[PDB]
Amino acid sequence: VTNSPVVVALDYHNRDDALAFVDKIDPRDCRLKVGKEMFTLFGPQFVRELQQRGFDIFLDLKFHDIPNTAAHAVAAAADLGVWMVNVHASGGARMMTAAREALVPFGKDAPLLIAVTVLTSMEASDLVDLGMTLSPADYAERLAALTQKCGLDGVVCSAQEAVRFKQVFGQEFKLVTPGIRPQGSEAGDQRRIMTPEQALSAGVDYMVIGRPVTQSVDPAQTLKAINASLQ
């Protein structure tokens, strides 16, 4: 296990470019996140390579499909033995329930099943195009509520919803929060940001950090520094 609440988003377009970073850090420094980019590129074998080195892996594929597919996919992720696996809460109750139920057969080995609420890159203007009347926070709370009701272990959201969410769902409902920008860092397409420190104070369980770390020369050192701040 590890003590840092940091999950580094491995978003490279090259395998060796990722492992060059990974070989310089240690499983106690952080957990790793394999998303759509690196998974579309290298598949489940890359995830096994990381599990080989001993890291906990968060397969971030945000499964957002029909119940049938969602279940089989989560079951496939469970076969991979990942630490945590994704799903989109906007996929609905039936889809989320089918996903949870697909993990029962794996018993204890099952990975944590988290639901994405509202992407941290979306503000009201973004949600407004879908005809979504509610603010990011409000809609996100509606999605998390459905997530909790379907028995999921937690949610992915912005740290800007951490205090509120922690209160409405409790300390047990895990909150995984991306949109982490230490001060000075470039926001990019990220919108509901917060600094590593602000996120921890908001009481999040896990913070997802990508570019601030991977975009630096010597990213291991940056990951180290961030961890230092969380003390």
Next chain:
Amino acid sequence: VTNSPVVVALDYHNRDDALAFVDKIDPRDCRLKVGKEMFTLFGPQFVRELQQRGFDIFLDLKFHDIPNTAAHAVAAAADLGVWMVNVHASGGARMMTAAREALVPFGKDAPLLIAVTVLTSMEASDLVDLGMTLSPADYAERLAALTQKCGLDGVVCSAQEAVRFKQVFGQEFKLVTPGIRPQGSEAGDQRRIMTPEQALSAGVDYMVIGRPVTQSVDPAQTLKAINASLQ
């Protein structure tokens, strides 16, 4: 190439079972869809093996993430050289815009880019939980309008919307529709369904068929039957 609008959904938990089927057919008979289940299990290499056989592959991972991730994932799909790649329209305009732009550097090689509107497994009730008051039809049409405004090649929807969409977005805008159930077959978690013949008559450009084919007592003849019906 094939002149059939049929795209068979390869949803198997066993690589060889899937190949045993694929080998009983021919690229001239249909196209194949590799979804989250098989892709999570066997990754990009499976797609290549299907491609090495001459089939046009529809990569269906419904990328629904922050603009930066959607772009890199879509780019990764183009690197795979697939015929068609997926995306979730509810991901917003900025995300879909990033996806379209990430395909520009691939020129002519760029795969077809389509956005999923409302999943065929959903009805009003399913959307109500999300706080969505618009009907599956209207919400879908809204998602299809945004998809076109962002410059995508088409949308994934129900055949129940084909007629409407076709006359509101034009013949050019491509419609890919799952939820295809020939009379007698099981509906399952599918809700907004139509038979192959009805879907064709409805104007869909491509129709996705999974269980009706893969789980039939003789999938090859079932494909043959359907293809013949569509004539």
